[PDB]
Short mmCIF file of C-alpha atoms in Angstrom, two decimals:
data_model
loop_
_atom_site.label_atom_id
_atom_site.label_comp_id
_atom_site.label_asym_id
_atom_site.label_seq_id
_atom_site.Cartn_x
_atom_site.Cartn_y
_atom_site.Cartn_z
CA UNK Y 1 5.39 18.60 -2.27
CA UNK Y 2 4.36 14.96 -1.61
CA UNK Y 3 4.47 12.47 -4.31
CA UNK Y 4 5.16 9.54 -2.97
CA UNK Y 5 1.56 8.67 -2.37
CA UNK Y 6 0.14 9.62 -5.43
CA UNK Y 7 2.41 8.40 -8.18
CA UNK Y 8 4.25 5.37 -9.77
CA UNK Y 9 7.66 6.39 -10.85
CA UNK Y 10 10.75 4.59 -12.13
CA UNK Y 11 14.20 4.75 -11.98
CA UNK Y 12 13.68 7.27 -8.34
CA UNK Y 13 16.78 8.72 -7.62
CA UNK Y 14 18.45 7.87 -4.21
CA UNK Y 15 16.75 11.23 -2.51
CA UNK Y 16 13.30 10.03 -3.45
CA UNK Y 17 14.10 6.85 -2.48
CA UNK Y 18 14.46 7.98 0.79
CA UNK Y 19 12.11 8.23 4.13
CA UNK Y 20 9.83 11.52 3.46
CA UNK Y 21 9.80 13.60 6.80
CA UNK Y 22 6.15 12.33 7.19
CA UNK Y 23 6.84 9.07 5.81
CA UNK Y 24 8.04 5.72 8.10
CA UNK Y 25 9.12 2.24 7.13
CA UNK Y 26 7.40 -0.19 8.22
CA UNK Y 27 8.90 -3.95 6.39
CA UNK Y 28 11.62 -4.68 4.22
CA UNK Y 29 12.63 -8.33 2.28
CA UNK Y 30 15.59 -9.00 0.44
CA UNK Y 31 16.75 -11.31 -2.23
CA UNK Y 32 12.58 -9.96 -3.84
CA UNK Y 33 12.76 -10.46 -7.50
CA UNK Y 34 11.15 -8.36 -10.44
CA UNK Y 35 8.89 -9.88 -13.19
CA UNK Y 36 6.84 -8.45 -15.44
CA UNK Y 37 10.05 -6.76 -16.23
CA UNK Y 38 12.06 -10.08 -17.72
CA UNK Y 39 15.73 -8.59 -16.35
CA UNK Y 40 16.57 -11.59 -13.93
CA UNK Y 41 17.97 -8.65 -11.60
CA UNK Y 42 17.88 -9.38 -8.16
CA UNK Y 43 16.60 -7.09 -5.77
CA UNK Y 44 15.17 -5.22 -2.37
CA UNK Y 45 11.76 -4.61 -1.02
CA UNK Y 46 10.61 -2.23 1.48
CA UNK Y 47 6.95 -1.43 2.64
CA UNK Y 48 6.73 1.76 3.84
CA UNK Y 49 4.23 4.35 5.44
CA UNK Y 50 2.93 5.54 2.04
CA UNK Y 51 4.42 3.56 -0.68
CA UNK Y 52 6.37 0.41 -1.95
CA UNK Y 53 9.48 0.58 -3.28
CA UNK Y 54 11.61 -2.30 -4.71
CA UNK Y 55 15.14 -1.33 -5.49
CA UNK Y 56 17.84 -3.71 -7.10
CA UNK Y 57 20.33 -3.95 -4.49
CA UNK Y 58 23.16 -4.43 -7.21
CA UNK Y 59 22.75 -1.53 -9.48
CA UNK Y 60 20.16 0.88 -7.19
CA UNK Y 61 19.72 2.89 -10.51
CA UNK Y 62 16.67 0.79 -11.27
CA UNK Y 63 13.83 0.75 -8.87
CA UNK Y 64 10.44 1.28 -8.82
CA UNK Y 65 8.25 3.59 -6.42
CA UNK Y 66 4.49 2.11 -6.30
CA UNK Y 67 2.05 4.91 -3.90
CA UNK Y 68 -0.95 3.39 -1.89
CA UNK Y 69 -3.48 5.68 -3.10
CA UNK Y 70 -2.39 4.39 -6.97
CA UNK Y 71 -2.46 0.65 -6.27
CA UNK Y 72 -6.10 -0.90 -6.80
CA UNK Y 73 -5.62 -4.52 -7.09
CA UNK Y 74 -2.52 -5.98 -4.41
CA UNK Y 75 -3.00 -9.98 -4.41
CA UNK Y 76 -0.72 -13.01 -3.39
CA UNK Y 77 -0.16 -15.93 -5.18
CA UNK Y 78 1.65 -19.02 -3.28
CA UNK Y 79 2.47 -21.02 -5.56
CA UNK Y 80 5.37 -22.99 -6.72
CA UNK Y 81 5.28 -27.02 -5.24
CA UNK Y 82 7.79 -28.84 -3.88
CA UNK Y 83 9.93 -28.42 -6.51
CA UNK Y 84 11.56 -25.91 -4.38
CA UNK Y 85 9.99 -24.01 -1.49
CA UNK Y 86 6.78 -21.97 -2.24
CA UNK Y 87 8.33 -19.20 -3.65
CA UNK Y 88 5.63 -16.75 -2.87
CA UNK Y 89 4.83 -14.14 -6.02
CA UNK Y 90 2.80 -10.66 -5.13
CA UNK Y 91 0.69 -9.31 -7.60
CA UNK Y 92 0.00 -5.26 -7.80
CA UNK Y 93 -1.95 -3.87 -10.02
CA UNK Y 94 -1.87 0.34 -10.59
CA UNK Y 95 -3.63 3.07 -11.95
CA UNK Y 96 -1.50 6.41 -12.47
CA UNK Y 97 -1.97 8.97 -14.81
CA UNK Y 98 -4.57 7.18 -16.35
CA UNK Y 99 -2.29 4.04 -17.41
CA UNK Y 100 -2.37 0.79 -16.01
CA UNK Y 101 0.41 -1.04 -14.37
CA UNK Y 102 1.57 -3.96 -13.44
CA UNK Y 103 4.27 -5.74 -11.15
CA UNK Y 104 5.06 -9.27 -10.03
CA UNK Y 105 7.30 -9.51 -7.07
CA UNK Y 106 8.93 -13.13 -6.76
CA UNK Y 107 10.40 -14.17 -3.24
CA UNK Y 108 13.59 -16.03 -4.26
CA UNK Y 109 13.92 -17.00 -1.22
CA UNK Y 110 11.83 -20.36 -0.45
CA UNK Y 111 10.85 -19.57 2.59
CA UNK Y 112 6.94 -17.52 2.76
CA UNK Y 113 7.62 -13.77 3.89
CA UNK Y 114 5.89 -11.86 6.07
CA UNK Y 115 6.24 -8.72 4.26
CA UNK Y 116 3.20 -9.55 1.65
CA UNK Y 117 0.71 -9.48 5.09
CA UNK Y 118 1.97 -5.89 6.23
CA UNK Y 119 1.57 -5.09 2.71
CA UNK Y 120 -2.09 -5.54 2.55
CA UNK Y 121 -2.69 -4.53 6.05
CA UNK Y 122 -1.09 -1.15 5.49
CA UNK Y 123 -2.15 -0.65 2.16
CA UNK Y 124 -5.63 -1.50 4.30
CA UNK Y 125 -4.93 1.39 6.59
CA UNK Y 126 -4.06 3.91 3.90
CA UNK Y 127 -7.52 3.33 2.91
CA UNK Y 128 -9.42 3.32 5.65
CA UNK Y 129 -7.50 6.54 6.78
CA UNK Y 130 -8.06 9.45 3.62
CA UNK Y 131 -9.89 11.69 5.89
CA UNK Y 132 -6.62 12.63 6.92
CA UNK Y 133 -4.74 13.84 3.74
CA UNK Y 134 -7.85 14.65 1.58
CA UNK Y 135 -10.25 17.61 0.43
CA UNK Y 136 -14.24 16.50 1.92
CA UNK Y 137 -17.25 17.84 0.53
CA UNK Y 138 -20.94 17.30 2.19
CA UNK Y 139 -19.51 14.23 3.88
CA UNK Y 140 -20.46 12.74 7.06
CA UNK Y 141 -18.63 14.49 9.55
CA UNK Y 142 -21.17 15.55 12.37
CA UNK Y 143 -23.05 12.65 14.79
CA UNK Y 144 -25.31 15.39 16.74
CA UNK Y 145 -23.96 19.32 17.00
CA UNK Y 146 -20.63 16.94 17.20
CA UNK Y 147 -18.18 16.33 15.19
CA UNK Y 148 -16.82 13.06 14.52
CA UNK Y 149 -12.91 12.44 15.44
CA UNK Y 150 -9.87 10.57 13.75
CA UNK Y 151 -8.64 8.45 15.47
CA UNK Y 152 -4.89 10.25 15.72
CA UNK Y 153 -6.64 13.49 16.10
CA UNK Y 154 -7.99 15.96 18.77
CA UNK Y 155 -10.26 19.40 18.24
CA UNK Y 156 -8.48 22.32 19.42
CA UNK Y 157 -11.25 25.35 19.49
CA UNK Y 158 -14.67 25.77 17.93
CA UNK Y 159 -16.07 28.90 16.58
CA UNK Y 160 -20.04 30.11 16.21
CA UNK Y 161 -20.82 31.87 13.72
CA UNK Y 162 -18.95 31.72 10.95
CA UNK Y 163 -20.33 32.18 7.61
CA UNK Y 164 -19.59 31.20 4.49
CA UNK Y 165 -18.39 32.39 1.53
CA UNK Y 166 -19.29 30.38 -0.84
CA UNK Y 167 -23.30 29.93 -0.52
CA UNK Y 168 -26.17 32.72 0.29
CA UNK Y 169 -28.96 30.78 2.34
CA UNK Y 170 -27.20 27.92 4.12
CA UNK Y 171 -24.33 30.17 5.86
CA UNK Y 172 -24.20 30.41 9.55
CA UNK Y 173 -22.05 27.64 10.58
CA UNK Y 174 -19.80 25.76 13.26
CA UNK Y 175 -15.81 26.12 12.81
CA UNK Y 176 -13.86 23.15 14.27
CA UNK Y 177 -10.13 23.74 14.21
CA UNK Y 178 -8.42 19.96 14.60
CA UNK Y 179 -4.83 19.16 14.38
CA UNK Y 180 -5.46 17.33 11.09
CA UNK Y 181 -8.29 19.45 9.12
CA UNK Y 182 -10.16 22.90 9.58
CA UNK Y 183 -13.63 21.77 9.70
CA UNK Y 184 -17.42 23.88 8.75
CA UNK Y 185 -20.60 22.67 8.88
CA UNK Y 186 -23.85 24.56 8.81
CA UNK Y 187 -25.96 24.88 11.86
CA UNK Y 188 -29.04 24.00 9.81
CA UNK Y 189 -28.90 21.10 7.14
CA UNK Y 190 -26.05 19.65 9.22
CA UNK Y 191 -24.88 17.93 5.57
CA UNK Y 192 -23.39 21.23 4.27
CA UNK Y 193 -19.79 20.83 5.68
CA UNK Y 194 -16.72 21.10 4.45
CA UNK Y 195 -13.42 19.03 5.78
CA UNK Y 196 -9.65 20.72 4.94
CA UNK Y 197 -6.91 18.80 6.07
CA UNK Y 198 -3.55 20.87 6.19
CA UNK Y 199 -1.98 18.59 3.95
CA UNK Y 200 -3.95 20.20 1.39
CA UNK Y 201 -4.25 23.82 3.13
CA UNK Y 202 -1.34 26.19 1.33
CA UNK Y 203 -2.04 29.37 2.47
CA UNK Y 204 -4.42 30.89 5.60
CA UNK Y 205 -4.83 34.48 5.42
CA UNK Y 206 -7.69 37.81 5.53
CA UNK Y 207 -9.10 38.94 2.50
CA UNK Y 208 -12.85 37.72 5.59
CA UNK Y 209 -10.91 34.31 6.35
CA UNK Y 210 -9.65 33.03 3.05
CA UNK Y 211 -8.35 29.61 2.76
CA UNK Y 212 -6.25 28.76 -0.06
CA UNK Y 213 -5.91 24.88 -1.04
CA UNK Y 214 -3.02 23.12 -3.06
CA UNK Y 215 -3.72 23.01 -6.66
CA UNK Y 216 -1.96 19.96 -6.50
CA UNK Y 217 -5.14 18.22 -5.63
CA UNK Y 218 -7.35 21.00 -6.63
CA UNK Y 219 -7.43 24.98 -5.80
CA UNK Y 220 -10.16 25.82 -3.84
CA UNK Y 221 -10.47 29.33 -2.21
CA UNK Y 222 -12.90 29.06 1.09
CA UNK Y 223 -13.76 31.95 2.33
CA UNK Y 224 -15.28 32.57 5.86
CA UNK Y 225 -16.62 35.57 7.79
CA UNK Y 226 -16.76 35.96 11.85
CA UNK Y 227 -18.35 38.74 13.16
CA UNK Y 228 -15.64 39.85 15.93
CA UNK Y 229 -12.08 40.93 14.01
CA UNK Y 230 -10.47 40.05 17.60
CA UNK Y 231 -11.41 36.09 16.97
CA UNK Y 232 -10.99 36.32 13.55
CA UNK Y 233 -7.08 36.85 13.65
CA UNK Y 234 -7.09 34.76 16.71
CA UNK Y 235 -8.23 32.08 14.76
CA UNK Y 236 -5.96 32.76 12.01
CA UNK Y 237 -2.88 32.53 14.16
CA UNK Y 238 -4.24 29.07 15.98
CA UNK Y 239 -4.95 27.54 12.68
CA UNK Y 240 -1.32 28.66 10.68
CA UNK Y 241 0.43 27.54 13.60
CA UNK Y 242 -1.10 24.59 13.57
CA UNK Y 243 -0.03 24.22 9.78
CA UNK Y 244 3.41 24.80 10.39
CA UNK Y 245 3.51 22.49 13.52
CA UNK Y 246 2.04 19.75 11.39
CA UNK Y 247 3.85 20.49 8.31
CA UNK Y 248 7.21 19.83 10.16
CA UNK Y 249 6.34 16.29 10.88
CA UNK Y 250 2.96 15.33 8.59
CA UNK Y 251 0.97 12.43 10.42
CA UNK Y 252 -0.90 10.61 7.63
CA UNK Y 253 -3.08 8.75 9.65
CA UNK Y 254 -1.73 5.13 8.58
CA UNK Y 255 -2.27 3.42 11.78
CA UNK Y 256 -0.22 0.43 12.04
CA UNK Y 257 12.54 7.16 -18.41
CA UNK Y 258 11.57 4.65 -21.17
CA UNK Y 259 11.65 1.67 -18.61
CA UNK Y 260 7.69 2.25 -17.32
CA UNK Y 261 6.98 0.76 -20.97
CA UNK Y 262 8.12 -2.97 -19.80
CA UNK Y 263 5.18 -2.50 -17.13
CA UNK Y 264 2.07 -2.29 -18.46
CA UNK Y 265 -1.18 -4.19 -17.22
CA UNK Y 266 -2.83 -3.98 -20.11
CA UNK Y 267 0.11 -4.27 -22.58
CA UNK Y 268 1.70 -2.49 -25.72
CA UNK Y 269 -1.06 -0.06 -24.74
CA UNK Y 270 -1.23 3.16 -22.56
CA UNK Y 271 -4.33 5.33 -23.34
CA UNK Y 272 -7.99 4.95 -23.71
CA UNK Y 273 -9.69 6.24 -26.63
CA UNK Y 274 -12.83 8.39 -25.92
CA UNK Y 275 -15.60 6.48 -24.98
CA UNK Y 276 -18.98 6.76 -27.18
CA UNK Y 277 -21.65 5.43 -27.62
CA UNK Y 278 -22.58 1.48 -29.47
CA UNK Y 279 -25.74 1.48 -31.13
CA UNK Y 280 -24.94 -2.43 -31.36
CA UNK Y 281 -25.02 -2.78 -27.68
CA UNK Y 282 -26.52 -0.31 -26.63
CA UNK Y 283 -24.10 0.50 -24.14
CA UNK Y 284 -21.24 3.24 -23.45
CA UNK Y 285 -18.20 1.55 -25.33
CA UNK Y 286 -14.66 3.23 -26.14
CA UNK Y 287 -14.27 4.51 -29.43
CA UNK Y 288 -13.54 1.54 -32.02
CA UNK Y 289 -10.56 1.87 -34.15
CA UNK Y 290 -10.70 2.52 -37.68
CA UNK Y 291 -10.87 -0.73 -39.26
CA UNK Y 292 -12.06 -2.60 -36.59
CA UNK Y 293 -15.94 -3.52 -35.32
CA UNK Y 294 -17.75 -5.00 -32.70
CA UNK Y 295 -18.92 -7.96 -34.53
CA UNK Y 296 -15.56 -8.38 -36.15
CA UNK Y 297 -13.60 -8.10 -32.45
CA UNK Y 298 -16.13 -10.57 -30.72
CA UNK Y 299 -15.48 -13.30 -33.59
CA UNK Y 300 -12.58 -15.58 -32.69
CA UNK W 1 12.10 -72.00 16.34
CA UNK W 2 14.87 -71.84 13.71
CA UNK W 3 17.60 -70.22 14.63
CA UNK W 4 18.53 -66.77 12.70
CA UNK W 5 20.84 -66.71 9.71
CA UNK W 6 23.05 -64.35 11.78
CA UNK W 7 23.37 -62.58 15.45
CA UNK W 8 24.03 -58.99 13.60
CA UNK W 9 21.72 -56.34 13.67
CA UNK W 10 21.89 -52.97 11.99
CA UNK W 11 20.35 -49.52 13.32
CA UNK W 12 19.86 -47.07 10.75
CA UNK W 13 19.08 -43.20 11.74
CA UNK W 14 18.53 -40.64 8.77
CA UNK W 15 18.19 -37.22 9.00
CA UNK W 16 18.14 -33.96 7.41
CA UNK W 17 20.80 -31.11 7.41
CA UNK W 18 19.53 -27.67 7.17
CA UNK W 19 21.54 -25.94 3.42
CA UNK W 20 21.03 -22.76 2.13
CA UNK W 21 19.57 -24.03 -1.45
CA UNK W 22 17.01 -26.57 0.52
CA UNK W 23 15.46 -25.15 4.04
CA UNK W 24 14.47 -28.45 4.58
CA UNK W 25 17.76 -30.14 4.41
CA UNK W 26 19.76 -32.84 2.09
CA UNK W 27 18.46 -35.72 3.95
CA UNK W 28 21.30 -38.01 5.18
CA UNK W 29 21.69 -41.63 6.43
CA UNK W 30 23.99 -43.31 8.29
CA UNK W 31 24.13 -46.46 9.95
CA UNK W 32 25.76 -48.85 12.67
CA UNK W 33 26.22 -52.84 13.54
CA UNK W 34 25.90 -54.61 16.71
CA UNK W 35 26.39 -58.41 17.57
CA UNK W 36 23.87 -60.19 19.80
CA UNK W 37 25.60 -63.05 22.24
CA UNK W 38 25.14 -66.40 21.25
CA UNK W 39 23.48 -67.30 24.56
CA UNK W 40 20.26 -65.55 23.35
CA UNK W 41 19.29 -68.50 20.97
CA UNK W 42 21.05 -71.31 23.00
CA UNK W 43 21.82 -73.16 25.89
CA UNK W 44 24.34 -75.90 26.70
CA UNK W 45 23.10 -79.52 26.44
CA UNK W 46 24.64 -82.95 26.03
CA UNK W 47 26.83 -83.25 23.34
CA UNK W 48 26.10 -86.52 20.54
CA UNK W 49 29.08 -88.72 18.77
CA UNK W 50 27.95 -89.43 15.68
#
């Protein structure tokens, strides 16, 4: 399954750390520092296709594997007068598993690197790209009967027809079977349409076209009925070999235990209590501790 | 119109050599002496007694 970019993990082992099939490097600095963990230990960079992943290049044991579609805030600070070179520092800021993270990358090196502009530029990419590796709903697909393409991407067949089987009114739709995504949209209100990549596709098969989507990243089951059988399976074949054809290489689009504790954003804490409601304020607030108040938390 | 103190004269070059702790270099100076000919400042003339 691919992890790489949707976690943060810690201490990867040397498979992990390790070019996924799909995945491709794309920079790499050495002599890169790690603070916000206050070790002193030396280490490796790399920039990849989906992920950053900083390793110590003494005792590999300890590393750190950052995904794009985790990191929200990725700034550079240059810094650090004539003292010594500008040590350039790189700032990335994380939300997994509903924690935030933190990590400050230090170029011992005086010199500026390049590696903290392909950073942002691919991490830019990744962004800008999701319709690749990601479950649509009612999005804007369509320009006129059309759809719209990717720009690594080209439509193999489209199918009349086809129903759906999810709905009772707004059924008779247009089937566009892509090398990326399996794509429906309705032939009237054009904004009914539904995007699949086959990242996220597990399982084609006839139940009277079910598709079956990884639970992963939520399981859907899409079901779809053509009127001739003969197309039907036809289509069924076209779009499982195109699965497998794409699951041998994925293309992602990207044009171009205890240690996770030292890495906190917010610090010494990890979880947000529920959030209710402040009659002080009047606004949505999380829920106060026991002792604590709002009055008694805004005093200095 | 006075004549100099001395004929020497000193050209000093400094420099910077490229280290791995400073990528802008130690910077360096070295220097070197020449002697200007006497025949710069004078001239023959006649020569007094006393």
């Amino acid at each position: 399954a691919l992890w790489e970019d949707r976690d943060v993990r810690f201490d990867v082992s040397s498979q992990q750390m390790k070019t996924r099939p799909g995945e491709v490097l794309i920079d790499c600095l050495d002599s890169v520092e790690d603070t916000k963990g206050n070790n002193g230990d030396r280490g490796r960079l790399l920039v990849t296709n989906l992920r950053i992943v900083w390793h110590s290049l003494a005792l590999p044991r300890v590393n750190l594997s950052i995904g794009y579609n985790c990191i929200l805030n990725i700034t550079t600070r240059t810094a650090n007068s004539k003292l010594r070179g500008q040590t350039e520092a790189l700032y990335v800021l994380t939300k997994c598993n509903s924690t935030r993270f933190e990590f400050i990358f230090t170029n011992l090196v005086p010199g500026s690197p390049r590696l903290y502009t392909s950073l942002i530029a691919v991490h830019r990419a990744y962004e800008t790209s999701k319709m690749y590796r990601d479950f649509k709903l009612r999005s804007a697909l369509i320009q006129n009967k059309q759809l719209r393409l990717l720009p690594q991407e080209n439509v193999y067949n489209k199918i009349n027809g086809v129903w759906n089987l999810s709905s009772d009114q707004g059924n008779l739709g247009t089937f566009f079977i892509t090398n990326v995504r399996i794509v429906w949209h309705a032939n009237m209100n054009d904004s009914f349409n539904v995007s699949i990549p086959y990242l996220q596709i597990r399982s084609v098969k006839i139940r009277a076209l079910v598709i079956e989507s990884s639970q992963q990243s939520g399981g859907y089951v899409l079901g779809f009925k053509i009127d001739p059988v003969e197309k039907l399976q036809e289509s069924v074949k076209e779009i499982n070999s195109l699965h497998k054809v794409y699951s041998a290489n994925p293309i992602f689009g990207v044009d171009y235990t205890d240690a996770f504790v030292a890495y906190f954003a917010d610090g010494n804490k990890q979880q947000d209590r529920e959030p209710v409601f402040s009659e002080e304020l009047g606004l949505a607030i999380e829920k106060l501790k026991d002792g604590f108040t709002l009055q008694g938390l805004w005093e200095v | 119109s006075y004549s100099p103190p001395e004929l020497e004269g000193n050209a000093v070059v400094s420099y910077s050599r490229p280290t791995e702790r400073n990528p802008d270099g130690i910077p360096r100076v070295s220097q070197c002496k020449f002697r200007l000919p006497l025949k710069l400042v004078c001239l023959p003339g006649q020569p007094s007694k006393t």
